[PDB]
Design an enzyme around this catalytic site. Structure first.
Site, PDB file in Angstrom:
ATOM      1  N   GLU A 185       0.848  -1.203   0.000  1.00 11.42           N
ATOM      2  CA  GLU A 185       0.000   0.000   0.000  1.00 11.42           C
ATOM      3  C   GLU A 185       0.886   1.256   0.000  1.00 11.42           C
ATOM      4  O   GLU A 185       1.789   1.400   0.837  1.00 11.42           O
ATOM      5  CB  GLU A 185      -0.907   0.034   1.237  1.00 11.42           C
ATOM      6  CG  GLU A 185      -1.779  -1.206   1.432  1.00 11.42           C
ATOM      7  CD  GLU A 185      -3.073  -1.249   0.627  1.00 11.42           C
ATOM      8  OE1 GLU A 185      -3.936  -2.124   0.914  1.00 11.42           O
ATOM      9  OE2 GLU A 185      -3.220  -0.407  -0.289  1.00 11.42           O
ATOM     10  N   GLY A 186       0.609   2.149  -0.949  1.00 12.10           N
ATOM     11  CA  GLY A 186       1.151   3.517  -0.964  1.00 12.10           C
ATOM     12  C   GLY A 186       0.076   4.509  -0.560  1.00 12.10           C
ATOM     13  O   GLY A 186      -1.033   4.076  -0.217  1.00 12.10           O
ATOM     14  N   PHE A 234      -1.652   6.822  -2.267  1.00 13.05           N
ATOM     15  CA  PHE A 234      -2.771   6.993  -3.150  1.00 13.05           C
ATOM     16  C   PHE A 234      -3.029   5.727  -3.978  1.00 13.05           C
ATOM     17  O   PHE A 234      -3.970   5.727  -4.775  1.00 13.05           O
ATOM     18  CB  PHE A 234      -2.537   8.260  -3.973  1.00 13.05           C
ATOM     19  CG  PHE A 234      -2.643   9.505  -3.127  1.00 13.05           C
ATOM     20  CD1 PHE A 234      -3.868  10.128  -2.932  1.00 13.05           C
ATOM     21  CD2 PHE A 234      -1.520  10.051  -2.526  1.00 13.05           C
ATOM     22  CE1 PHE A 234      -3.964  11.271  -2.153  1.00 13.05           C
ATOM     23  CE2 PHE A 234      -1.619  11.193  -1.749  1.00 13.05           C
ATOM     24  CZ  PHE A 234      -2.837  11.800  -1.564  1.00 13.05           C
ATOM     25  N   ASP A 294       8.731  15.151  -6.366  1.00 14.22           N
ATOM     26  CA  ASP A 294       8.468  14.166  -5.353  1.00 14.22           C
ATOM     27  C   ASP A 294       9.677  13.246  -5.126  1.00 14.22           C
ATOM     28  O   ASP A 294       9.534  12.013  -4.915  1.00 14.22           O
ATOM     29  CB  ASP A 294       7.188  13.400  -5.714  1.00 14.22           C
ATOM     30  CG  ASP A 294       6.487  12.768  -4.479  1.00 14.22           C
ATOM     31  OD1 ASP A 294       6.558  13.334  -3.352  1.00 14.22           O
ATOM     32  OD2 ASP A 294       5.859  11.690  -4.643  1.00 14.22           O
TER      33      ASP A 294
END
Ligand SMILES: Nc1ncnc2c1ncn2[C@@H]1O[C@H](COP(=O)(O)OP(=O)(O)NP(=O)(O)O)[C@@H](O)[C@H]1O
Ligand SMILES: [Mg+2]
Length: 301
Positions: free
Chosen positions: A20-21, A23, A127
């Protein structure tokens, strides 16, 4: 859009969940079309978003991630990337791995060649941080992610991990600048170099004021002479005046060549901050020891 995204792509077949990230949910898949391995980011839900997806497909550079495809129907869209074995974040955090000067020079060389290309094609990463510097099995680093999912995605409700992006955030951004450029990425690059040299985050602030505090007590409180117009920044704040810590006391094993690079990446004035092309021309990269070839860079087992 219905007519600019394919609704189905049957050629991908899931293998195993990766993680899981913020977004997206990412997972491992095989392209049935080429027997290759890929990572697919699944994003929950726009003219601009599609343009951003298309642009990053059109990019081609050894140290930029491949975005290979995009598909999705209504409330979801899925982005297909090159599968990458690891990243700089797990490399940094792995106590079994020793980071030589040659290892560090290689990671930096590849990062900066990536940025140089991006910035040459009029594009800001925005980012950069260790977990967005990906590493294949053969020791090729690729700039990845680009905040595409952030850009148009609903947040990931199952994301339990620590949000760290402010640690890599330049001071003009913390002080609310509405215009900005390559200095944004260059600053992150410096924080990443620092984290390779110290094996811990350089400026781990827990709020935006504490991030600026940490920046100034470490690098010194700037003046409008080092930074013209600083005090006209939208969210500018006056702090306790700090003298800063000499770079050679922070980075106690660095030679003048590497300290020069680090100083250039951390100049406060974003116009003066060293560019990716200038950084690559610095004596640091022509100096011995030379950078480690990909096949000898340490792999987490
Ligand atoms: N190209 C890739 N190859 C292998 N694993 C990947 C790849 N991209 C992401 N991952 C994995 O996916 C998980 C985190 O997803 P990632 O998208 O990197 O998180 P993030 O930085 O929060 N960005 P986002 O998910 O877009 O909000 C980690 O376990 C990564 O190792
Ligand atoms: Mg990521």
């Amino acid at each position: 859009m219905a007519l600019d995204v394919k609704s189905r792509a049957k050629r991908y077949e899931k293998l195993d969940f990766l993680g899981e990230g913020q977004f997206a949910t990412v997972y491992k898949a095989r392209d049935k079309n080429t027997n290759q391995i890929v990572a697919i980011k699944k994003i929950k839900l726009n003219r601009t978003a599609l343009r951003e997806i298309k642009l990053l497909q059109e990019l081609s550079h050894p140290n930029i991630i491949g975005l290979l495809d995009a598909f999705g129907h209504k409330s979801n869209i899925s982005l297909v990337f090159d599968f990458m074995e690891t990243d700089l974040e797990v490399i940094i955090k792995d106590n079994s791995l020793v980071l030589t000067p040659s290892h560090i020079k290689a990671y930096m060389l590849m990062t900066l060649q990536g940025l140089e290309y991006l910035h040459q094609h009029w594009i800001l990463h925005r980012d950069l941080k260790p977990n967005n510097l990906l590493l294949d099995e053969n020791g090729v680093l690729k700039l990845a992610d680009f905040g595409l999912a952030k850009s148009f995605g609903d947040p990931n409700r199952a994301y339990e991990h620590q949000v760290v992006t402010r640690w890599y955030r330049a001071p003009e951004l913390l002080f609310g600048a509405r215009m900005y450029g390559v200095g944004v990425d260059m600053w992150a690059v410096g924080c990443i170099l620092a984290e390779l040299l110290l094996r811990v985050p350089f400026l781990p602030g827990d709020s935006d004021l504490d991030q600026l505090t940490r920046i100034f007590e470490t690098l010194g409180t700037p003046t409008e002479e080092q930074w013209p117009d600083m005090c006209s920044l939208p969210d500018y704040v006056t702090f306790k005046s700090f003298p800063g810590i000499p770079l050679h006391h922070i980075f106690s094993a660095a030679g003048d060549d590497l300290l020069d690079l680090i100083q250039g990446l951390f100049l406060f004035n974003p116009c003066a901050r060293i560019t990716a092309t200038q950084a690559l021309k610095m004596k640091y990269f022509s100096n011995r020891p030379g950078p480690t070839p990909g096949c000898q860079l340490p792999r987490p087992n």
